Amino acid sequence: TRPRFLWQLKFECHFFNGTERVRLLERCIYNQEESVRFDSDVGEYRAVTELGRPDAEYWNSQKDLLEQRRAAVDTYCRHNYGVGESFTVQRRVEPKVTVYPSKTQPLQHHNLLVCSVSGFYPGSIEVRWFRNGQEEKAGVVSTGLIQNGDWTFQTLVMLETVPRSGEVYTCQVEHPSVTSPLTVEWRA
Amino acid sequence: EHVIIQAEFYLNPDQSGEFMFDFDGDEIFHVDMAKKETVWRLEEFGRFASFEAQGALANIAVDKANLEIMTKRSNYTPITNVPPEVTVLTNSPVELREPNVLICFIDKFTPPVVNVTWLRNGKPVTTGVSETVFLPREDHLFRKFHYLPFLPSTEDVYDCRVEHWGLDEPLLKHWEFDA
């Protein structure tokens, strides 16, 4: 089918340490190449590829527009930040932890264990394993932070072993939505 | 720690465009260009804040305008197709006779035009299927979503049908409960 032409525009607000540090980064992109951008840390527009040239020299000319794009750190970035602070930054939902085996087998013939945290937000999460109270940093192959798009995460941290009877495995999970790390144990 | 993104776009010849806000990768809200109304991701967000949809409508008018310019100055060089990556997934470890939801995560693709269709045993569906506008990524490609709810079984086999212009043939992704 026909050729496509695209124009993407992004206004970015990098918030470091809550609001104590902000950095606005206006970016102009054509197709998939950023042609011109503004940076609070530089104060003015600057080209990034020959096509950007006209633009940069341009805008920076209107010291009037520039003055605005520089204050935008307080009227836009900062202002917006506290608009949705409650349902975004503060957003917190306690995960759901569960344990089960992948391919039920005849005990002691090397297996794999998969903790399936699900329900998340925020993302920053931890989930260690503990065979009989002993932590293992050996055999915990993980899928990684999986974002679902409905504002909820779900990671799967697996562990490979060999089911000796009596052994009691456990998946621990610390989340900012819980004052005390959640836990779940499974008998071998 | 946190990043908000006022990302938007206009595409030709599709003459389609979009405007939405983003908080750390999660759409906060977007404007329904046609209905000219702001659409909050999670209905909750609206009982709290707001957004004059009328504003996005105007920003885009300019974007359209900027594309025309750039397209010309760039001497009509067009976008290079970039095939997405689909990865069917689920909301939570499927439990027989226990509700779930099949996700179809379209990712790393551009331009912003992709067809998706849900197949249950080969056949099409409309069982509470919704999607997400084109989400932004750091490399400027796009990341999309598609959800289909469903009550598990062994009496069923599902599939995510994804058509894009970088693909040489539709992209099929099968999902089926294993026992």
């Binding site: 633009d55 527009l65 009227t75 836009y76 506290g82 | 006022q6 957004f51 305008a65 900027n66």
Partner: peptide, 13 residues
């Protein structure tokens, strides 16, 4: 709490 958009500018003609 009103969300404020950032107006897009016209490129160099």
């Amino acid at each position: 709490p009103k969300y404020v958009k950032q107006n897009t500018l016209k490129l160099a003609t």
